[model samples]
Target: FSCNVDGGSSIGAGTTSVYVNLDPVIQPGQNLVVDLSQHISCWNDYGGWYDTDHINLVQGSAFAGSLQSYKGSLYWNNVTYPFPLTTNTNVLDIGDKTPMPLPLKLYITVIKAGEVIARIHMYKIATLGSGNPRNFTWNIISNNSV
Candidate 1:
């Protein structure tokens, strides 16, 4: 749900869903070529100084909170907290299969906080060991804004 609200709508304005009215989506690695002019062509709060907008990639199902880290980093065999005991689903002693997709959702957003592009990471994994380099640039934009 990409914030559907009325932060600022007027009486004679055919009012509805004002504020940040942006919703874009794409699969991983697929360059999303947008005619931002169309996005910029938004009505409602048209001409309001958004200054600029933001973009991000999130799974379309469950929530994997924002990866707001820099310089140093974090990757793991799996998720856990304050303990040495590793609870892995990667059949270490037995033989079960399936790797959870870090490519899904976490919503409850409102309008104006940010642009809620309906993006997803889809599927990803590796063998019993080793890993692939997953690099990404949490997004932002300049111009094409008002």
Candidate 2:
């Protein structure tokens, strides 16, 4: 499922026509590990951000984990993992197909520039049941910055 940002949510003075939220299919407060890779093509109708020409995330040990169950899911091969892996009829739990809170050890490189930015990580519990896809941002204290 995708979302269109009513008006343009652009930074400067432009508009943000569409905004897609990706929620992982994992329970709340659960910590899993996943390797981060810019190898996913998450751009569509959103702009030039839709292309598999920049990111480089490998399927093996990739950023495929749950931030929140059912809200958003990681997709590949035209289908989300675990769902098709389970035929979309089974319940998913930690270590079901792999591990929980999969670790993300990846190098992210920007292929194109845009207004909206996507933050990937496990979210809190309160956001659950609210029926809203909460945006979870991962803080990286690199080079003693931020």
Candidate 3:
């Protein structure tokens, strides 16, 4: 997956585009975990205080866990101690009876002071398989940070 930020601004709102290239066959009853924490690089001729007030998943078919950050940095999973290893975790459970959609869409909201500062649109081009449920955790192929 890759994140692409649309538009540049020292202040105000923008959009983030997330593209998933890997189309792994997701088996039935599988769980897909997507991590939104990534360090993005940008050259700022303009200066301002960049603060992330909150991030909310607006649209998607999965459970968004891992509320906290990791190592003073951001990670996907919320559980510490073991670090990234979550027990009895089901971030996204894929059903066996229903068919998984191709090119799934995930929408996110980045808010500051109760205002939408940025939007994240994730497109998944993947396949799903039948069998035992698999535990899947997504990695950051690209960052959309400022």
Candidate 4:
């Protein structure tokens, strides 16, 4: 097996990589989840928003699923993670509210200010992926940066 270690050039408070992976077997009603479980420091400095009312989710606002969950995905910046894999979190039921045909994806950004993200863990999965994202409803489930 290959080892997962941080290389010299790719070290620091950064979320600067873009990636795409195919699912082993994406089925109807399949779901996905993303966890930002890095235990970041100085999260309070992220913005005026704090707590459930305003998550670190950069929307100037806040805020998945499986067979029993509605054919979508979920996300979380955990107290920790099982490690780097959306497939694992998708099935974990981390308050996933997405109601789309396919599972979802998440994007994390670390702006070199020691801040972390607990952004897209949706508690209110009602208005998730209804159609256009210009106006949709979502909520911050929990933030466990560790």
Q: TM-scores of all models?
A: 0.18, 0.19, 0.24, 0.23
- Per-residue lDDT value at 73 in model 1: 15
Let me know the TM-score candidate 3 reaches against the reference structure: 0.24
lDDT agreement of model 3 with the native: 0.25
Question: Least accurate stretch of 10 residues (summed lDDT) in model 4?
Answer: 1-10
Worst 10 residues of 1 by lDDT: 91-100
User: How do all the candidates rank in terms of lDDT, highest first?
Assistant: 3, 2, 4, 1
For each of the candidates, the C-alpha root-mean-square deviation to the true structure, in angstroms, is: 20.5, 17.7, 19.5, 16.7
Comparing 1 and 4 on TM-score, the stronger one: 4
- For candidate 1, the C-alpha RMSD (Å) to the true structure equals 20.5
- lDDT per residue for candidate 1 within 73-142, as digits (tens), equals 1122232121111221221111112211221112222122344222222122222233221222112231
14-119 per-residue lDDT for model 2 (tens digits):
1222222222333554422223322211222223322211111122222222211222234433334431122221221121211122222322211112222223
lDDT of all predictions: 0.22, 0.25, 0.25, 0.24
User: Between prediction 2 and prediction 4, which has the larger TM-score?
Assistant: 4
- The CA lDDT at 65 in model 1 is 24
Clash number by candidate, in order? 6, 19, 2, 17
lDDT of 1 at 144: 23
Give residue 64's lDDT in candidate 2 (0 to 100). 24
- TM-score of candidate 1 against the unseen true structure: 0.18
